Amino acid sequence: ATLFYTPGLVTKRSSHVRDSVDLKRIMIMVWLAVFPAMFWGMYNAGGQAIAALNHLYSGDQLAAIVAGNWHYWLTEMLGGTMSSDAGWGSKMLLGATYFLPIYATVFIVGGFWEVLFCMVRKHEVNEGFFVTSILFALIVPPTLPLWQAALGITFGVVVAKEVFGGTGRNFLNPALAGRAFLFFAYPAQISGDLVWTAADGYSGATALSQWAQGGAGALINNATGQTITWMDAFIGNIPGSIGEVSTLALMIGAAFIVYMGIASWRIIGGVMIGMILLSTLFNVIGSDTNAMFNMPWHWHLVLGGFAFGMFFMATDPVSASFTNSGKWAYGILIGVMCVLIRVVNPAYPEGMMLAILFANLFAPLFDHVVVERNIKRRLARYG
Amino acid sequence: KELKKSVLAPVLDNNPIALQVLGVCSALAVTTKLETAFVMTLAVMFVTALSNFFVSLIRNHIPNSVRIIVQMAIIASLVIVVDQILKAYLYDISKQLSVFVGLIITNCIVMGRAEAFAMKSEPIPSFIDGIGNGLGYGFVLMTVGFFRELLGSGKLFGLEVLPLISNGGWYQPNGLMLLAPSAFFLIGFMIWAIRTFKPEQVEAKE
Amino acid sequence: MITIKKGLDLPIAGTPSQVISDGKAIKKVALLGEEYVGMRPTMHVRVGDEVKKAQILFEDKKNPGVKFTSPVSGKVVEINRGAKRVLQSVVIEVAGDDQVTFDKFEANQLASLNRDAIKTQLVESGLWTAFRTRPFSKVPAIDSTSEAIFVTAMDTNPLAAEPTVVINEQSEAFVAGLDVLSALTTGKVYVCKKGTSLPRSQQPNVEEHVFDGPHPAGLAGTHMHFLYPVSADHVAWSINYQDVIAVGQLFLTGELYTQRVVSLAGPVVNKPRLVRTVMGASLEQLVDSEIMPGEVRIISGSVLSGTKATGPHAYLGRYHLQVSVLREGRDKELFGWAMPGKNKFSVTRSFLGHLFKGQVYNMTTTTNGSDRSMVPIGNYEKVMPLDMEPTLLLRDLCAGDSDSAVRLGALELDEEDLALCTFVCPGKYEYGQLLRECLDKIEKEG
Amino acid sequence: MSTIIFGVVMFTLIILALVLVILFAKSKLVPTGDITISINGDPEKAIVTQPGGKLLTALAGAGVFVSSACGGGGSCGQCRVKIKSGGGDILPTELDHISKGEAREGERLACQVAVKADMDLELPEEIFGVKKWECTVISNDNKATFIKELKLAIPDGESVPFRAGGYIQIEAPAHHVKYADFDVPEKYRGDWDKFNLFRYESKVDEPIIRAYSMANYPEEFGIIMLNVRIATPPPNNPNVPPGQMSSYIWSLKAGDKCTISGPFGEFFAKDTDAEMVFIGGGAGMAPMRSHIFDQLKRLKSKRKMSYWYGARSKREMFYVEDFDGLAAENDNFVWHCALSDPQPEDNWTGYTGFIHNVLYENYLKDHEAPEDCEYYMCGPPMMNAAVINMLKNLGVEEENILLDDFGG
Amino acid sequence: MEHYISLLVKSIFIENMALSFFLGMCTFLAVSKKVKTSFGLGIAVIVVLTISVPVNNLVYNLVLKPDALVEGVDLSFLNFITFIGVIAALVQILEMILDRFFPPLYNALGIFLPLITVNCAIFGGVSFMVQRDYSFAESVVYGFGSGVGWMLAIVALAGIREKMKYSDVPPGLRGLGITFITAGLMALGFMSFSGVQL
Amino acid sequence: DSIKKTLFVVIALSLVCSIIVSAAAVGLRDKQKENAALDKQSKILQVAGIEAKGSKQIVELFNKSIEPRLVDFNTGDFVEGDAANYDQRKAAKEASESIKLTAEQDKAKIQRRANVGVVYLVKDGDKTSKVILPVHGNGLWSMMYAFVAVETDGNTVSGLTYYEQGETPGLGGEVENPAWRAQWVGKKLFDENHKPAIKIVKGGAPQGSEHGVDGLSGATLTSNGVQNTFDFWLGDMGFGPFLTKVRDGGL
Ligand SMILES: Cc1cc2nc3c(=O)[nH]c(=O)nc-3n(C[C@H](O)[C@H](O)[C@H](O)COP(=O)(O)OP(=O)(O)OC[C@H]3O[C@@H](n4cnc5c(N)ncnc54)[C@H](O)[C@@H]3O)c2cc1C
Ligand SMILES: Cc1cc2nc3c(=O)[nH]c(=O)nc-3n(C[C@H](O)[C@H](O)[C@H](O)COP(=O)(O)O)c2cc1C
Ligand SMILES: Cc1cc2nc3c(=O)[nH]c(=O)nc-3n(C[C@H](O)[C@H](O)[C@H](O)COP(=O)(O)O)c2cc1C
Ligand SMILES: Cc1cc2nc3c(=O)[nH]c(=O)nc-3n(C[C@H](O)[C@H](O)[C@H](O)CO)c2cc1C
Ligand code: FES
Ligand code: FES
Ligand SMILES: [Ca+2]
């Protein structure tokens, strides 16, 4: 309807000329900014799946595993191959047959909840769901069941957004309120080591559990036998979620939305300052039995979901602070809580989701402190 | 029959967790299992009824200075007797109700009724009001416990209803139902349903 | 010298050529009734009564004693009344030169007058309506005074007239008006200007201040926030430079001096320049054979804060000093929001227009987008130079929290101050009407 | 068995120590003096009282209610006092009833306050100076099908000091009533027999207090002239008791003195050149007769006036000759009337319909400036709400309308 | 001196009274409209909690403990009545000591300062102290930590409900329903400290 | 009102309530003790294999088949003392009955160790058939307590149960699974060199090996706890010397 055409309205009152930006352009720019991370995530998921399958099985056993799962036999039908000499085309196709069902079911179910609430409360259906659906489908593991994906997006849309009123009226992160529902409800399929590498019968840990086990010397990639260098964890050759692994593509995508004024360099610098300060404190303290006290900042930055969280999920405008003085505090709190949940909490090997969902409650307190200082400065007759 | 409307006013017209906000901590922390929900419903009903009856019996001679001390003495003696009887004949449920067999003293329903209705009425309508508010509270306990226990472990009173995967069935339990956020959400949507079936309890917009 | 760093100089095409040329012959004038805040008129005329210059047309029910008088001598021809019989305009048709005169004084003896003589002169002449108080932007009551009269002697609106070109012709009247204001006020007179030179008054309590930077460095609200912060019990007045020239000419000649120099400009005006024009003139006769063919919108004031003049409102307002005309953008475009909009203006850097420094745009009256809810991407802090919290303040205004908005600072404001926040909002809100509803709530609540 | 003895002794000691320390700390901390209030800040009529307790009971002990309608909760917001002394903290229910601008001076609700410290209260407007009178009944002739027009007289021939349109705080005695007890004149009995209205029986257990309105001007001494509407419930079930003060009158035989008091002063006519337009209300017509006769005789207003008035039938109509003679002797007056339910036996030669339509389609639409006028209104709910819609649709702002209705 | 800081940090964050043990919900969800009223009630709860926990620890360790008065006699059934008596007496004498002065804090809370007696945070704090068998200094630090954690949670909810003036809630969920769901989301966010070994 | 009236009414109320409360509190301690004993007697009879249903059957089987003793941990010898009244959890808190574990031996993170310990001997008429050792350590969310039923040779395991755990029930609370407890039967505790050899393997056990049972799937951090309990308690600070005496034939 009004997706193709601008509405052709005119202004009725005081400002007879307006800007040129709208929620359509803003949310479509943020939706385009994660396309490099999407394409690399599909490539890397396919590469890890093929490497694990050819490390485990071989020959007729590999043929029996291939002909017994539709992600493998469809990929070999459409033209690719599942042997060790696979191309980037076959790797991205095998990543696509894992990612695209999750994106499809998340978009359709969340769109149904959007349309139902919008028909009941008699509004016009707005954007922002374009951002929420892709950010949800890019942070769940590549082996997540479709019904759990539907439940996660149902919780995220209904309980966190559409009860409070829609776009611009909630207070949490709707893409992370759904993942927290999945993470605390069905944690057998979103934790561990059976879930991250999208293979069959591959049980091997990842980069943040290997450090917490045995330090930087235990960062070995069991599929290939090689070791995980910093350039590998920076380029994005590690197991993990779909589109979180590549810090280079995340920086390349988020430099544009930082330049355009949509994402906030205040929050990004706050998260970086908090991470650096707490990780340096833990380095200088040091411990003999906890192997995470001596993880430097240039390793905290690249592993897990720190770069995706800091760039695309800590910079949500509706949930953040509204003051320039409070955005630094909100970012610093996010960084401190992320490094703290990583280092000293042993049940969870990564803490960016819980850090963001914890600072979303204390952002309006920082708003209140800054605006109360301003009200005192006003009552003293200087503002 | 005045007793019918007296016991059936607070089941849906004046529900103590829906319209008033009294007795929420026990509603959040007992409803994990339907057996403990039933036992807590019965115990709060018993304590509220007998407390209202006694404080209405001596309502003329209670002084203005130490009315709080006298009311908490009566409620605390009743709850200590209830606790000894539970620990003697219902020991496993008493273990599952670890500290909340003491917090019936500081539950707000018992003292709110003993202050609002007990001090200005007759013992028999006081007893009836206590029973009615116990019922109106047990309704919310029972519904939240039904949804939480069923969707979170596939059981009702311990009886197996939905066969789990570990046994070999088809259901995989929702691990969030055993935590208090699920109680919060279920009570919120129950208030939505109650106030959309009865629209004279809508909070007026400011 | 106070410099403004946060602001926006809007690049719209058609900047006028600052020379004063003669205007067209004006045949109808009108005294608009809706544009005075909180006025309830009691009409002193009906259709067909012959009036004079400075003869009363209506009083005020809520501000007793003030008189609104006709700008020109002629004959009433129309009294338009809208829904619920609200007064819109009193259309007068000019013929003749009959007028009501007053007393006159010398040049140097103006500075030492009696305050009540000054006030009765202004009230009988109907030039008392030039003062707009702050807060609440009403005409001030006839028996109240103020310690700060803020004279606005600069103009940073888009396509606005240059004040020095006007003032350099009527320097003696400007200085006499400043001396009268110095005698009228209790404390000081705050002449706010830019870095050029203006005629100065030799009174000790007439102070000159230099404001620079982009808009809104040329608003009385910004001048008040930086020089005399007002509140519920501190009340400051306001008057632009043309009305000070009017006060000076009134006290030097005895006759109400009603001429104006307005800036006729826009994207669709053939030769934008300054014109001479009587007060409250008819814009449809002002822009006769001055506009390109095509549907156009004739605003009375700048494009940021100006009353659209169509029909019974097609007359120049009281407090407006320019006319701006522009097209009508009623076209549907396929995928218009996804273009690399080289011909599209924005404060942010989404569009490719920001790389082309020095461009001017043929901006049309369209709203690029539908009404949505407010997502604060950080646009208001870029174009609000004051020491307020813009996102919190505007969210309180949209929510309808009068007490909280007053506490955050919505007493010092006027709808021409939130014009830029209305301008740069991605949700396409209009905060002027919300501020007016909030201030009307504060007034009615007492 | 030793544990039982120790439990008893330690329970008693543990309770008694807390009771003793609470009583000791209270006897050290809380005041015990005799606090004082002074009415109007005056040495005479000042009242000493015990600390605590609401101010509602103080004037009730002093002998006036408040001038309140409701004592419980302060929901109507009747009790007000203009206190200049320090009373304490403001309460939001006061700030609901008394807006910020008025509450800035200190207009507070009385029963919300619990006076526990010293205070000089204002208590203005001579509510201490209210006295009583034992009004006799003259007759209760029925002028309409359902109306109860009423005449009373004050004992020994004087005049109530009430300001114009001010209804008294009239009270009622109690006596159980059936409709068969109610005496009916000749024409209205047949249609009341058509509704067979003698069928219901009612009980008056307590003397009900109802501040009805009266039907004369303050200068008319020696006669009080009250007013009473028909008492009628939903007529499917009239067994529930309707209108206890009305039913007290509907079988009353005249000549018994009635202890009543409490005048009011609501209808303040402004002394200006304001055009007055009195829009009718059927029952309660005579309040406007009272105010217009006060403005004719007591004040001698020569400004332009009007009495648009609504009627169901000419059988329902009453007091015609009053306004007929008034418009005859008067220069600046005109009076009209319209049928709500037209019937053939009148053969009516005037206006008909609702007062909403008749006023707009006769007078106001071609009027010059209705915003300068002044409108008083007292009548039926929809026949008043439609007229408020009409007047807001035409101009006039809220304060220029002066509303007062039966029960608001 | 690292141990008592460990106890304070734990009792503020890891074992929050309002959002990890879920006690006090009636006042937590009823008095959460304005942040200044929430601040005042938080300070009152802090004072009453840090007074009530050490005195109850003294009474327990001197009298109610098994074999404390006479060997062979244990009086641990008077626990509940002793605790609620000491809490009620402390609240009453503290409201008198307060109400002498302080029209700032008096009538700002108003009705709820009598209602912090029947408030499960204080009784839960006393019962958990008795269960965990603290000493006197650990009792003081635990009481102060629980009080500051409760104040933190209620001031957070007040700030959220003052941010929610802009929102549009369906009419069935205006007020109590959306307050329940807001508290549920807050409790979901506070599970970051759920596994910490402190 | 009257101080005499308030003091009299509070004394009378306190007397009545104290009589009722003290009677109802003293008159039930026997039943509370019986229930608290039966709740653990059921678990011991269950891990001994003897089926139980009903309170009479439970008390009758426990008094005729199970025979508790007291054992000193360090020397590995028997110590005379009251068996049915001992509380090892509370005796492991006082400094006169427990020792401070240093960090190099405390593999299981329990931080203390009682001086005397309690076991249970399953009797078969006159012969001793089994010996049940209560072991515990730290998991992820709680202190996991358990029993283990060792046969008379001091090497063989005949059953295991977990009667106190607070893990998440889908991931690491599978220590209470019958399919997981049913693997421990027949496994050896020690090797031929008399060293602790119980292994929790990650990814499934070898097909019938006598030293490694299946680990919990997706729950390594609790599998480390289940490994550390036996790694410490089969060591030298636990049931090591007593197990040597049982192996030599001290029963
Ligand atoms: C200044 C002023 C002037 C007034 N003047 C008049 C006047 O002239 N005439 C007049 O009648 N009132 C007048 N009133 C209103 C007066 O308060 C009413 O008499 C009052 O509302 C009825 O009180 P009651 O106890 O007599 O009614 P009750 O006898 O207790 O009966 C209740 C009232 O509602 C009706 N009713 C009875 N049962 C039901 C039921 N089940 N459901 C619904 N309605 C029921 C009855 O008809 C009756 O009027 C005036 C009020 C004010 C403030
Ligand atoms: C925004 C974001 C938040 C995340 N939060 C968590 C978390 O709280 N806990 C967690 O185990 N994984 C979280 N993850 C996934 C981790 O990045 C990582 O993929 C996962 O923890 C696997 O652990 P690993 O780092 O060893 O691969 C999050 C990912 C993203 C993108
Ligand atoms: C909500 C939640 C609860 C968990 N509970 C446990 C648990 O109780 N026991 C356990 O061993 N692991 C638990 N885990 C998993 C741990 O985080 C741990 O990462 C997992 O055992 C993976 O270890 P591994 O990769 O070395 O096998 C839980 C995970 C989540 C998300
Ligand atoms: C830079 C930017 C980042 C955003 N990040 C998120 C996000 O992380 N999760 C989400 O659900 N919506 C996100 N949105 C969409 C929007 O903010 C969301 O609907 C708000 O939470 C409104 O509820 C983002 C929007 C922008 C412009
Ligand atoms: S707080 Fe639990 S009932 Fe009042
Ligand atoms: S009516 Fe009782 S206080 Fe106003
Ligand atoms: Ca132990």
**Whether C138 and C186 share a structural domain:** yes
**D202 CA closest ligand 1 atom index:** 29
Question: What residues contact residue E66 under an 8 Å CB cut-off, 6+ apart?
Answer: E74, E76
**Among E118, E112, E171, E142, residue whose Cα is nearest residue E6:** E142
Candidate from B107, B141, B187 with most ligand 5 atoms within 8 A of CB, to mutate = B107
- What is residue F133's three-state secondary structure? strand
Residue type, D254: A
D171, D209 Cβ separation under 8 angstroms? yes
CA distance F39 to B90: 12
CA dihedral A10, A15, A17, A22 (to 10 degrees): -70
Q: What span, in angstroms and rounded, lies between the C-alpha atoms of A345 and E195? A: 6
A32 vs A260: CA distance, rounded Å: 13
Separation between Cα atoms, residue A253 and residue A267, nearest integer Å: 17
Closest ligand (CA of A131) = 4
Closest C-alpha to A198, from A80, A99, A74, A83? A99
Closest-CA residue, ligand 3 atom 11, reads F219
Q: Are A250 and A235 in contact (CB under 8 A)?
A: no
Q: Which position has the token pair 């009236």?
A: F5
DSSP label at B164?
Answer: B
Nearest of A322, E81, F7 to residue C379 by alpha carbon: A322
Query: For residue F233, which amino acid is it?
Result: W
Q: Can you list the alpha helix ranges (DSSP code H) found in chain A?
A: 23-33, 35-56, 60-66, 70-77, 88-120, 129-137, 146-157, 174-185, 207-214, 230-235, 247-259, 265-285, 297-300, 306-308, 324-344, 352-379
Sign of the CA dihedral E177, E182, E185, E187?
Answer: negative
Residue nearest to atom 31 of ligand 3 (CA): A187
Radius of gyration of chain E (CA): 18
Q: Measured over all CA atoms, what is the biggest interatomic distance in chain D, rounded to whole angstroms?
A: 105
Q: B163 preceded by cis ω (within 30°)? A: no
Q: What angle do CA D233, D234, D240 make, to 5 degrees?
A: 50
Please report, for chain F, the start and end positions of each structural domain, with discontinuous segments joined by +.
Answer: 25-251
3-state DSSP assignment of residue F108: coil
Q: With DSSP H G I counted as helix, E B as strand and the rest as coil, what are the percentages for chain F, rounded to 5?
A: 35, 25, 40
The DSSP secondary-structure symbol of F101 reads P
Residue A32 token pair: 């385009």
D45: left (phi over 0), alpha (psi -120 to 50) or beta: left
Minimum Cα–Cα distance from B76: chain D residue:
D11
- C311 located within any domain: no
Euclidean distance between CA atoms A293 and B60, whole angstroms: 68
DSSP, collapsed to helix, strand or coil, labels residue A125 as coil
Letter for the amino acid at E108?
A: A
Nearest CB to E97: which of D6, D29, D89? D29
Question: What is the Cα–Cα distance from F165 to C445, expressed in whole angstroms?
Answer: 63
Mutate which of A26, A126, A132, A259 for ligand 4 pocket (most atoms within 8 A of beta carbon): A132
F10: nearest CB among D3, D8, D19: D19
- One-letter amino acid identity for C287? V
**End-to-end Cα spacing for chain C:** 38
**Final residue of a domain: which of C61, C94, C127?**
C94
- What are the φ and ψ backbone dihedral angles of F134, each rounded to 5 degrees? -85, 115
Question: What residues does each domain of chain A span?
Answer: 23-185, 264-377
Q: List, in order, residues 6 or more apart from C284 with CB less than 8 Å away.
A: C298, C314
DSSP per-residue string spanning E120-162: HHHHHHHHHHHHHT--HHHHHHHHHHHHHHHHHHHHHHHHHHH
H-type alpha helices, A121-229: 129-137, 146-157, 174-185, 207-214
DSSP code per residue over E79-118: HHHHHHHHHHHHHHHHHHHHHHS-TTTTTTSGGGTGGGSS
Point out the ligand 3 atom lying closest to the alpha carbon of residue F225: 11
Which of B172, B177, B205 to mutate: most A Cβ within 10 Å?
Answer: B172
- Does C226 map to a domain? yes
CA of F140 to the centre of ligand 3 (A): 9
Q: Is there a cis peptide before residue C216, judged by omega within 30 degrees of 0?
A: yes
My answer on whether C81 and C111 are in the same domain is no
Cα D119 to chain center, whole Å? 30
Residues 6+ apart with CB under 8 A from E135: none
CA C171/CA C175 separation, integer angstroms: 6
What is the C-alpha separation between B113 and D130, in angstroms, rounded?
A: 43
Contact A169 C373 (CB under 8 A): yes
Please give the full DSSP string across C129-194, using - where no structure is assigned. Answer: GG---BSS-PPPPTT---SEEEEE----STTPPPHHHHHTTSHHHHHHHHHHHHHHSSSEEEEEE-
The beta-carbon neighbor of F21 closest among D11, D19, D23 is D11
A192 Cβ inside 6 Å of ligand 3:
yes
For residues A329 and C7, what is the distance between their CA atoms, to the nearest angstrom?
26
CA distance B116 to chain D (A): 15
Q: Where are the alpha helices (DSSP H) in C214-336?
A: 220-227, 241-253, 283-286
Q: Do chains A and B touch (3 or more CB pairs under 8 A)?
A: yes
Show residues of chain A in contact with E194, CB under 8 Å. 347
Distances (CA, A) of C270 to A25, C288, C291: 35, 11, 6
Chain A residues with CB under 8 Å of F217 CB are: 194
Nearest to F10 by CA among E85, D119, B24, B199: E85
Is residue A306 packed enough to be buried (19+ CB in 10 Å), middle (13-18) or exposed (0-12)? buried
B203: how many CB neighbours lie within 10 A of its CB?
Answer: 15
> Residue F131 in contact with residue F119, Cβ under 8 Å?
yes
Q: Which residues of A touch F218 (CB under 8 A)?
A: 188, 191-194
Residue-range definition of the domain harbouring residue C53: 28-94
* D334 interface with B at CB cutoff 8 Å: no
Contact call for residues F99 and F127 (beta carbons, < 8 A): no
> Across D2-61, where does the E strand assignment appear?
35-37, 47-49
Q: Nearest chain F Cα to A288, which residue?
A: F103
Ligand 4 centroid, distance to A176 Cα (angstroms): 10
> Sign of torsion, CA D231 D233 D238 D244?
negative
For ligand 4, residues with CB inside 6 Å are: A 26, 30, 128, 131-132, 135, 161, 167-168, 170, 173-175, 262-263, 312-313, 315-319
- CA atoms within 13 Å, Cβ hemisphere of C94: 18
3-state SS class at B40:
helix
Tell whether E143 lies on the interface with B, counting CB pairs under 8 A.
Answer: no
Give the residue among A242, A234, A233 at the shortest CA–CA distance from A41. Answer: A242
Whole-angstrom distance, CA of residue F85 vs CA of residue B75: 35
Chain A meets chain D (3+ C-beta pairs below 8 A): no
**Which residue has its alpha carbon closest to ligand 4 atom 3?**
A316
**Is C304 within 8 Å of C157 (Cβ atoms)?**
yes
Q: Nearest bound ligand to CA A30?
A: 4
The residue with tokens 């009836």 is B128
**Nearest to residue E66, comparing CAs of E133, E137, E135?**
E133
CA–centroid distance, residue A205 to ligand 3 (Å): 12
Tokens representing residue C4 in the block: 């403004």
C10 shares its domain with C150:
yes
Paired sense of beta strands D335-339 and D351-352, if any: parallel
Q: How many CB atoms lie within 10 A of CB B168?
A: 7
For residue E37, with 0-12 CB atoms within 10 Å meaning exposed, 13-18 middle and 19 or more buried, which class applies? middle
- Yes or no: say if D215 and D289 are a contact pair by the CB < 8 Å rule: yes
Pairwise CB contact (< 8 Å): E73 & D25: no
Query: Judging by beta carbons within 10 Å of its beta carbon (0-12, 13-18, 19+), is residue C144 exposed, middle or buried?
Result: exposed
Q: In total, how many domains does chain E have? A: 1
Phi and psi based region of residue D33 (left: phi greater than 0; alpha: psi -120 to 50; beta: remaining): beta
Contact assessment for residue E32 and residue E164, using Cβ atoms and an 8 Å cutoff: no
φ and ψ at D227, to 5 degrees?
Answer: -150, 140
- Write out the binding residues of D for [2Fe-2S] cluster: 70, 76, 79, 111
Tell me which residue range forms the domain holding E133: 1-198
Question: Which of F93, D351, A266, A58 is CA-nearest to residue C376?
Answer: A266
Phi first, then psi, for residue A151 (nearest 5°) are -65, -40
For residues C194 and C152, give the distance between their C-alpha atoms in angstroms, rounded to a whole number. Answer: 10
In chain B, which residue's Cα lies nearest the Cα of A181? B176
Tokens of B134: 């116990």
Give every CB contact of residue F198 below 8 A, 6+ residues apart in sequence.
Answer: F187, F189, F211, F212, F213, F227, F230, F231, F234
Question: What phi and psi values does residue A21 have, to the nearest 5 degrees?
Answer: -95, 155
Give the Cα separation of A181 and A148 in Å (integer): 10
Phi, psi of A251 (to 5 degrees): -65, -40
What sign results for the dihedral spanned by CA atoms E80, E5, F114, F122? positive
Phi, psi of C67 (to 5 degrees): -125, 135
Residue with the two structure tokens 């002794």: D9
My answer on whether C81 and C183 are in the same domain is: no
Element (H, E) at C298: strand C296-301
Same domain for C137 and C81:
no
Nearest C-alpha neighbor of E80 from the set B101, D3, F23: B101
Residue C153: what residue type?
Answer: A
Nearest CA to ligand 5 atom 2: B25
- DSSP 8-state code for residue F175: G
Number of domains composing chain C: 3
β-strand pairing of C206-212 with C56-60: unpaired
Does D19 sit within 8 Å of B69, measured CB to CB? yes
* Domain assignment present for C240: yes
Q: Which of C215, C233, C253 is the last residue of a domain?
A: C253
Residue C431 to residues C50, C399, C421, D259: CA-CA distances in angstroms? 41, 11, 7, 61
The Å distance, Cα A321 to ligand 4 centre, comes to 14
Question: Resolution to 1 decimal, in Å?
Answer: 3.2
Spatial distance between the Cα atoms of C145 and F93, rounded to a whole number of angstroms: 82
Q: Can you tell me which residue has the tokens 């009612």?
A: D202
Residues 6+ apart with CB under 8 A from C176: C107, C110, C248, C249, C251, C252
Sign of CA dihedral D13, D15, D20, D22: positive
Are residues B144 and B183 in contact, defined by beta-carbon separation less than 8 angstroms?
yes
Q: How far, in Å, CA of A173 to CA of A313, rounded? A: 8
End-to-end distance of chain F based on CA atoms, in angstroms? 76
